[PDB]
């Protein structure tokens, strides 16, 4: 399957191969036992050019994991702000919750990423929302010990 | 003794069995060397045999 | 001195006999193996961590051990990897000449002192430290054709009934078991455990208490009260022995009277220590024994010893339990040794024929028949003294020496005959005169041949180990040949040769011999007429010479190089690689599909297929596998269409259709090692694993932009795969009265498996493993089935105090010299040298992200001396001829014969399409050595005639060249014929025979046809200039 | 070489009798000289690194490779490698009714590297379609991680 | 605190199965007391360097260490060059009867 | 020989030192060994010349 060679290229960061596979119509919705799509991989491992090329090609922006996770979740947890914005412009559910109740904000506030937390907030992300534990963006920031993130989310 | 039961010698006995089994050969190789040495010194097969 | 043993024939006989005896004794107490030890000493520290990922193993075991490998002597480099199968393996390689015993004990000791720093379960399991540079003599497969016992059943039997017996057998040094003995297995059930408010913590606690060896005292023990009459020992509780006893282990006694047994919450049975690997032999469950040869032991006497012991323990095998021999190096040694004796025998018969064809008398043809065998037996003694052994290298080393041995014998005998025929001198005084003509020449030759062969035994590392065998072997035979040619042979001539009247060249005699003599005696005129004309036009031939030299250089650099010729070992391997996350079941289908291909589309050539599911030389896990294919005899696979390379390529091309995985066949190395490089990418800062992977990919992509320099540049490891991370919330846990220890044990034991303690099975100590039943530990949705008892006594699900997420991690982490790394393999593009492809890789690596270093390991290290050694060699040779001739100039007329022998070898090698390997190179040196010997004699005679009877330059050269025609011709005729069998040899170690054959025959023809014409020219032009 | 071997042979018999705190600190058996062959000084020309920073870099990036080269019997670090130092406070401990005992216990339970096995691991049930390692708790890597310990 | 049958199944046999293949082994004798102690003696051909023999044995011994019971490892196992007889016996007595 | 091995090993590390990190050689008993020997060799040649 070309779909597999796509998952390898999307993860590896080979734009040239990825574009080529685009020419050849390799499945853009290909999956692996984890449910991760080429867009999942690219968002997680942070390559933008791929993300855009993938989105231009009909990829599900709100593709979910077997555990409910999405590309925004992946990009927010990891550090890529540029990826976050591109994803949001294409219709990524800002309030997408995990099987465990985690949203893109939680993963962001959990790891800090103040610059990414602001972007998610100005897009209608709940303050309110609770993860399985019942922690909220503020609960996660205070416990973590981030005073700067406490002001933003307050 | 019954089948399945063997034996072997150790230490002082082991060295004794060995000393005995090597003896014959030791005498043989010694006679050969002496014969040859004599043949070489005197350039002959008859007198070393005497 | 010849004149000493001419008057004392009996003395010479004594020496001949002593040499024979000493040799005979040596050829009986001398080790026998396929190859000597060539690889540098290497020690491997192995450790296991049941249920541990690649990351955990490295950060708790690998790193702790690596930090303690200091203070050890003669380390070249350290290497290690950490798999997701819970395994770690640290290999330390040492300088050549390092006592492997001392090296291992130093590694072992440092490891001991680091043992207290390792995880508990890693200590329980134990840490191994073994010499890894060793090679298997054979592997003994043990299958069950009855289908009445699993591979665990076979394994346990082999370990408790065979492993020990084989180990004690004479000759075997080490024995590896391809499996594991039994082990008590407790397959827990989470649904049941929760029903009785129990956890894997309870199950473990109960087993450690109701299955242990409790120490008690004695009755009437010291100090006693006076009057005590008996003194007996007290026996307490002792470890359990049966499956039934374990199931009876008490866990909980309900408040209603009933009890809960271990049997009630888990299935109890005997299984294997692990289930990672599953082995099959032609589709049948199998196990085996990897057997190694003890040092100094005889491989043949050992292979026969293990087959006797196996047959001696045969009547005790269970039903349908048969043993097979998938791998065995014994046949190679038998064939090798047999073909050496054969060659040596038919070499004496040929020398006998050519000796009688030219000389035409039995008494003379008898002399070489004695001189040659004496020298052979003698060199075996010389080898023994140095500590060498009978092996493939030293064996061929002699079949190349017979040419120099037969020569020295033919030269002494023929010269005596030629003298008596040219003057009415009786044998005794003819031998004196004859020897007086070649005494100095023979000694000088011994020096020259030493100068040619001895420097070759100075190459460093592995490559040096190989050359050292040939060199020392050939040099010994050479020096021992000249010695016999100055003692035994001269005595045998002045005693066994009959008088021959002057002018009697058998020119008039009956029949063939009479015709042959007139024919040859007239051809010696046609020959001296040609040389006479040649010496009238030397300029024309100086030009032809340069053409030969130029052609030599061209044909030399255009010849591909390989270290040792590839062979058909009757076996080959096929790798199997499934995608990431691929299950053991899937891998099995592909392996069945591979085995089904061999036992069908190759039934004529394939004997068996040993499918090992879960193993790989560069990575392990459920998604990997190997198939060891064993072929039928070489007498059942005729033609190149049925050899390994033909079958391999045809197999690889057939497995390409499989869209499920990457499957390809490939012949194994000649010696267990290849070509290409061993590049090591090193994280020299704190970059991490992901940053290192990027630097690798970046370099791999760059090397892809040089298909004219770099080919097949690939990573020698595994690729990152999705992992299932669990996040235990510390807060909610403490808020429910649940201990983190309870959590990480019920999880670690149920899903990972925990080794609890030991029990005795039929008088043998074995392990006890606790672990969840398969159906309760397969998917992420099963984690919720597991409950943990809190302080309040309530059972709390895992889905109450944890979360999860998919992640990426390495299944196999590598390290080099204490730092993170990734191994990179490659080779030089066709036509380019490794020294060029290496230089390029260094350049590409110099442009990598800051904090990324590199280094060379293995072959690529111990990587440079050839010209330096043959510059010293070239000099010593010169100085020798200089002293032999008392001239600074004359030596040149001898050293010019070198290219004449080389060109022919290059023609043959290139024509047949062979490589410039070690067999070829050694074949050259012997050709060069022999052709040089001819020149030395031709020059010695010519120079002598000028100094003695004051003959003219041309007059002397023509007379000298005439006298040397027959000797040179004879030794060359008997040589070529005796090598023919090697050149045409097919199958069975031919790859080696063909190398030593084509290289020699081609070079031997050109080195005599051209030398008899060119050396008279060299002598003249040199004598004219200087 | 053998003198060192024999010495360690008897040392291993004494090891189990030594206190755990001594064992886990590592016992060493050198066979070097008493005097120094040389001293490799390491300095920082800019102001980036302190005496502590330099010592730790040497110990973590230079010491091993040197103490591992043939000919070197012993390597003494004129400094010290870093370690996660937990400087506890008595007043704040008593205040929360805790002790150094409780602190050491929490560090072991929360700074741990556990083995959690795999999904679809061997022996698998018939029909398994996936196989991936399971990851549990991992060692802490930063001071900040150590501070969040409950 | 272990009988002879157990101390042989968990110690002696474990160590023996590995002591095969060493250079210059003539024979190997061993015994297992009820006091829980074992002893394995390996004799080598006359001329063998005893120092190398000790090392080689220790190398093979390390393989079996792990398989030994905890109580045994904690105990320590010693591999030394040995001899059978006594050179001499130094005795000590008290003459003024002040020492028992 | 060991001093040479140590220097060779140090050389493989320098290209990766953080900025400002420099190696200095405060104390070494090796140079004297080498220099002392070469001085005796110097007196040898001068001897044969004289």
From Swiss-Prot, chain B:
| Transmembrane regions listed in the UniProt entry | 22-38
Q: Which residues lie on this side of the membrane: Cytoplasmic?
A: 39-48
The UniProt induction remark is: Positively regulated by MarA, Rob and SoxS transcriptional regulators (at protein level).
Provide the coiled-coil residue spans: none
Null phenotype? Loss of susceptibility to contact-dependent growth inhibition (CDI); inhibiting cells still contact the target.
Compartments where located: Cell inner membrane
* Source superkingdom: Bacteria
Question: Quaternary form?
Answer: Homotrimer, with large domains that extend into the periplasm, interacts with AcrA and TolC. AcrA may be required to stably link this protein and TolC. Interacts with AcrZ. Part of the AcrA-AcrB-AcrZ-TolC efflux pump.
The entry's function note states: AcrA-AcrB-AcrZ-TolC is a drug efflux protein complex with broad substrate specificity that uses the proton motive force to export substrates.
Family of the protein in this entry: Belongs to the resistance-nodulation-cell division (RND) (TC 2.A.6) family.
Identification of the protein by name: Multidrug efflux pump subunit AcrB
Which species does the entry assign this protein to?
A: Escherichia coli (strain K12)
Full protein segment contained here:
851 to 900 of 1049
From Swiss-Prot, chain E:
Recorded superkingdom: Bacteria
> Can you tell me which family this protein belongs to?
Belongs to the resistance-nodulation-cell division (RND) (TC 2.A.6) family.
- This chain's source organism reads Escherichia coli (strain K12)
Job of this protein: AcrA-AcrB-AcrZ-TolC is a drug efflux protein complex with broad substrate specificity that uses the proton motive force to export substrates. (Microbial infection) Involved in contact-dependent growth inhibition (CDI), acts downstream of BamA, the receptor for CDI. Its role in CDI is independent of the AcrA-AcrB-TolC efflux pump complex.
Expression induction per the record is: Positively regulated by MarA, Rob and SoxS transcriptional regulators (at protein level).
Compartments annotated for it: namely:
Cell inner membrane
What is the protein name given in its UniProt record?
Multidrug efflux pump subunit AcrB
Describe the disruption phenotype. Loss of susceptibility to contact-dependent growth inhibition (CDI); inhibiting cells still contact the target.
Q: How does it assemble?
A: Homotrimer, with large domains that extend into the periplasm, interacts with AcrA and TolC. AcrA may be required to stably link this protein and TolC. Interacts with AcrZ. Part of the AcrA-AcrB-AcrZ-TolC efflux pump.
């Amino acid at each position: 399957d070309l779909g597999k060679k796509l998952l390898e290229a999307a993860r590896a960061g080979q734009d040239d191969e990825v574009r080529i596979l685009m020419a050849n119509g390799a499945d853009v919705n290909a999956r692996d036992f984890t449910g991760w799509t080429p867009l999942h991989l690219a968002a997680h491992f942070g390559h933008l050019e791929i993300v855009e090329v993938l989105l231009k090609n009909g990829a599900d922006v709100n593709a979910k994991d077997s555990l409910g996770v999405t590309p925004l979740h992946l990009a927010a947890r990891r550090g890529h702000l540029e990826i976050v914005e591109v994803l949001l412009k294409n219709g990524a559910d800002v309030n997408a919750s995990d099987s465990h109740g985690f949203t893109p904000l939680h993963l962001a506030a959990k790891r800090g990423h103040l610059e990414i937390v602001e972007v998610l907030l100005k897009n209608g992300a709940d303050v309110n929302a609770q993860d399985k534990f019942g922690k909220t963006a503020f609960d996660i920031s205070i416990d973590n010990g981030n005073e700067d993130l406490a002001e933003i989310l307050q | 003794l019954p089948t399945g039961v063997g034996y072997d010698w150790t230490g002082m006995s082991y060295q004794e069995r060995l000393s005995g089994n090597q003896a014959p050969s030791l005498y043989a190789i010694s006679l050969i060397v002496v014969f040859l040495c004599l043949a070489a010194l005197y350039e002959s097969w008859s007198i070393p045999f005497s | 001195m010849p004149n000493f043993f001419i008057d004392r024939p009996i003395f010479a006989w004594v020496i001949a006999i002593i040499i024979m005896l000493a040799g005979g004794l040596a050829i009986l107490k001398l080790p026998v193996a396929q190859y000597p030890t060539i690889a540098p000493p290497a020690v491997t520290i192995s450790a296991s961590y049941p249920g541990a990922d690649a990351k955990t193993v490295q950060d708790t075991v690998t790193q702790v051990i690596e930090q303690n490998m200091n203070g050890i002597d003669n380390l070249m480099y350290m290497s290690s990897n950490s798999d997701s199968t819970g395994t770690v393996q640290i290999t330390l390689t040492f300088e050549s000449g390092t006592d492997a015993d001392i090296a291992q004990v130093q590694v072992q000791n440092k490891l001991q002192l680091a043992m207290p720093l390792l995880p508990q379960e890693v200590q329980q399991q134990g840490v191994s430290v073994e010499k890894s540079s060793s090679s298997f003599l054979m592997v003994v497969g043990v299958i069950n054709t009855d289908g009445t016992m699993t591979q665990e059943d076979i394994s346990d039997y082999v370990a408790a009934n065979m492993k020990d017996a084989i180990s004690r057998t004479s000759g075997v040094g080490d024995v590896q078991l391809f499996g594991s003995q039994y082990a008590m297995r407790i397959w827990m059930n989470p649904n049941e455990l929760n029903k009785f408010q129990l956890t894997p913590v309870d199950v473990i606690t109960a087993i450690k208490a109701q299955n242990a060896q409790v120490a008690a005292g004695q009755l009437g023990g010291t100090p006693p009260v006076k009057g005590q009459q008996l003194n007996a020992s007290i026996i307490a509780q002792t470890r359990l022995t049966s499956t039934e006893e374990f199931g009876k282990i008490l866990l909980k006694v309900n408040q209603d009277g009933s009890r809960v047994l271990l049997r009630d919450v888990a299935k109890i049975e005997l299984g294997g220590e692990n289930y990672d690997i599953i082995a099959e032999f032609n589709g049948q469950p199998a196990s085996g024994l990897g057997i190694k040869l003890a040092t100094g032991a005889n491989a043949l006497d050992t292979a026969a010893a293990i087959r006797a012991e196996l047959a001696k323990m045969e009547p005790f095998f269970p039903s349908g339990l048969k043993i097979v021999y998938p791998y065995d190096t014994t046949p190679f040694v038998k064939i090798s040794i047999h073909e050496v004796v054969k060659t040596l025998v038919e070499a004496i018969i040929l020398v006998f024929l050519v000796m009688y064809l030219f000389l035409q008398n039995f008494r003379a043809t008898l002399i070489p028949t004695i001189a040659v065998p004496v020298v052979l037996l003698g060199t075996f003694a010389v080898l023994a003294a140095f500590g060498f052994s009978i092996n493939t290298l030293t064996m061929f080393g002699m079949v190349l020496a017979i040419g120099l041995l037969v020569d020295d014998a033919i030269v002494v005998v023929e010269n005596v005959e030629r003298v008596m025929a040219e003057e009415g001198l009786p044998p005794k005084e003819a031998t004196r005169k004859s020897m007086g003509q070649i005494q100095g020449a023979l000694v000088g030759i011994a020096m020259v041949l030493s100068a040619v062969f001895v420097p070759m035994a100075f190459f460093g590392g592995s490559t040096g180990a190989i050359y050292r065998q040939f060199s020392i072997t050939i040099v010994s035979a050479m020096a021992l040949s000249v010695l016999v040619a100055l003692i035994l042979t001269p005595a045998l001539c002045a005693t066994m040769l009959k008088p021959i009247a002057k002018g009697d060249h058998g020119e008039g005699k009956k029949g063939f011999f009479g015709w042959f003599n007139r024919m040859f005696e007239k051809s010696t005129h046609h020959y001296t007429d040609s040389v006479g004309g040649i010496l009238r036009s030397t300029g024309r031939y100086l030009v032809l010479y340069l053409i030969i030299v130029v052609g030599m250089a061209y044909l030399f650099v255009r010849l591909p190089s390989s270290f040792l010729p590839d062979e058909d070992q009757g076996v080959f391997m096929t790798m199997v690689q499934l995608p990431a996350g691929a299950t053991q079941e899937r891998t099995q289908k592909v392996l069945n599909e591979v085995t089904h291909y061999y036992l069908t589309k190759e039934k004529n050539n394939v004997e068996s297929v040993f499918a090992v599911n879960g193993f790989g030389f560069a990575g392990r896990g459920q998604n990997t596998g190997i198939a060891f294919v064993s072929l039928k005899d070489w007498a059942d696979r005729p033609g190149e269409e049925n050899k390994v390379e033909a079958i391999t390529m045809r197999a690889t091309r057939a497995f390409s259709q499989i869209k499920d995985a990457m499957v390809f066949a490939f012949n194994l190395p000649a010696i267990v090692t290849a070509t290409g490089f061993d590049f090591e990418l090193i994280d020299q800062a704190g970059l991490g694993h992901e940053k290192l992977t990027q630097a690798r990919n970046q370099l791999l992509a760059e090397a892809a932009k040089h298909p004219d320099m770099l080919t097949s540049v690939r990573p020698n490891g595994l690729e990152d795969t999705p992992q299932f991370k669990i996040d235990i919330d510390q807060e909610k846990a403490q808020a429910l009265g649940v201990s983190i220890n309870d959590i990480n044990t019920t999880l670690g034991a149920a899903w990972g498996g925990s080794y609890v303690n030991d029990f005795i099975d039929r008088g043998r100590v074995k392990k006890v493993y606790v672990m969840s039943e398969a159906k309760y530990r397969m998917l992420p949705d099963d984690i919720g089935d597991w409950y943990v008892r809190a302080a309040d006594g309530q059972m709390v699900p895992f889905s109450a105090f944890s979360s999860s997420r998919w992640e990426y991690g390495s299944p196999r982490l590598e390290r080099y010299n204490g730092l993170p790394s990734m191994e990179i393999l490659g080779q030089a593009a066709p036509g380019k040298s490794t020294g060029e492809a290496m230089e390029l890789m260094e350049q590409l690596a110099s442009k990598l992200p800051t904090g990324v270093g590199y280094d060379w390991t293995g072959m690529s290290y111990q990587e440079n001396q050839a010209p330096s050694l043959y510059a010293i060699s070239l000099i010593v040779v010169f100085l020798c001829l200089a002293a032999l001739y008392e001239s600074w100039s004359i030596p040149f007329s001898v050293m010019l014969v070198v290219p004449l022998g080389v060109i022919g070898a290059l023609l043959a090698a290139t024509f047949r399409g062979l490589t410039n390997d070690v067999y070829f190179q050694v074949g050259l040196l012997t050709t060069i050595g022999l052709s040089a010997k001819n020149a030395i004699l031709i020059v010695e005679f010519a120079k002598d005639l000028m100094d003695k009877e004051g003959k003219g330059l041309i007059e002397a050269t023509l007379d000298a060249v005439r006298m040397r025609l027959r000797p040179i011709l004879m030794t060359s005729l008997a040589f070529i014929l005796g090598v023919m069998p090697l050149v045409i040899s097919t199958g069975a170690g031919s790859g080696a025979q063909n190398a030593v054959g084509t290289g020699v025959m081609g070079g031997m023809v050109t080195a005599t046809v051209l030398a008899i014409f060119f050396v008279p020219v060299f002598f003249v032009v040199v004598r004219r200039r200087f």
